[PDB]
Amino acid sequence: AFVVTDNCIKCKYTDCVEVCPVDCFYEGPNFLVIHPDSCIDCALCEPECPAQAIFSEDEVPEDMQEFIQLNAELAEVWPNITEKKDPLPDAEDWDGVKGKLQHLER
């Protein structure tokens, strides 16, 4: 499974959903997650993220390990997203800010 990590929060570009063959992204107010069961590990999404927030599960940085289980839990509750949409308004002010997990909205 590929995992979306911290830098997606408050950026939410949605470029990643274009390339997914299996539509495994689920949408929250200010973040996206990948559903782990459904992901086929094709890796096509991680070159597409402008925030460079997507990682193969086995490459998630040590300080972002929480995101692996988070993608798994939130994917069970959030709606499926299959079309790109516009980035959140202030997306590049927040792109690159560390520690955005305190800002995640359910």
Ligand code: SF4
């Ligand atoms: S690795 Fe492929 S199947 Fe998994 S979320 Fe990314 S684009 Fe979809």
Ligand code: F3S
């Ligand atoms: S910022 Fe997030 S919405 Fe997709 S394109 Fe990157 S993982």
